[PDB]
């Protein structure tokens, strides 16, 4: 008997205000110039 | 017996206000200039 | 017996107000200039 | 009997305000110039 | 009988304000110039 | 002066022959029964 | 002067033959039963 | 003067043959039953 | 003068044959039952 | 003058054959039942 439930993953749990650069949750490869 | 339920994934859980750059949840490859 | 139910994925769970740049949930490849 | 529940992973638990560089949760490969 | 629950992992538990360099939670490979 | 060029991302670089299950490059959400 | 070039990311560099289960490059969220 | 080039990331560099379970490169969140 | 080049990261450098459980390169969060 | 080159990181340098449990390179958080 296996029961897997209620796992929770959050990248940004609160406000992201007045951003002027780069906000990225998950980046695979890719280039960011900020 | 297997029961997998109620997994939750959130990238941005709260407000994203007055953004002037780049807000990206999941970026695979790609180039961001901010 | 397998039962997989009620998985939930959310990119932007709250308000996205007065955006002036680029808001992207999932970007594969692609170029963003902001 | 196995029950795995309520694991929680958070990258940014609080506000990310007035960002001018690069904020990244999980980066695999990739180049960041900030 | 096994019950594994309520493990919690946090990268940034508090505010990340006025960032001008590079803030990264988990970086695998990759190059950061700050 | 910024020049970003010739980034390359490949999911399956070689042959995928006689598949009988599920081959997926990038899966976001979703359920796979194989 | 910044020049970022020729980064290479590969998930499966060689043959994937006679698969009967689940082969996934990048999985975000999601449930796999194999 | 900065030049960042020829970084290489490989998940599976060789053959993945006769798979009957689950082969995953990068898994974020998610549940695997194998 | 900075030159950063030819970094190499490999998860599985050789064959992964006749797998019947779970083979995962990088797992963040998530539950594996094997 | 700085030159950083040819760093090499390998998780599994040789064959991973007839696996029946869980083989994981890098696990952050997460629960493994094997």
Swiss-Prot record, chains A, B, C, D, E, F, G, H, I, J:
Consequence recorded when altering residue 14 to K: In CAA-APP; Italian type
Site feature Susceptible to oxidation, where: 27
Variant or mutagenesis effect after changing residue 26 to V: In CAA-APP; Italian type
Glycosylation sites: 2
Binding positions for Zn(2+) 2 per the UniProt entry: 2, 5-6
Known function: More effective reductant than amyloid-beta protein 40. May activate mononuclear phagocytes in the brain and elicit inflammatory responses.
Subunit composition and interactions: Interacts with FPR2.
The protein, known as: Amyloid-beta protein 42
Organism: Homo sapiens (Human)
Source taxonomy: Eukaryota, Metazoa, Chordata, Craniata, Vertebrata
Gene name as annotated: APP
Part of the whole protein covered: 680 to 713 of 770
């Amino acid at each position: 008997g296996y029961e897997v439930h209620h796992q929770k993953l959050v990248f940004f749990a609160e406000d992201v205000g007045s951003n002027k650069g780069a906000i990225i949750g998950l980046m695979v490869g890719g280039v960011v110039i900020a």
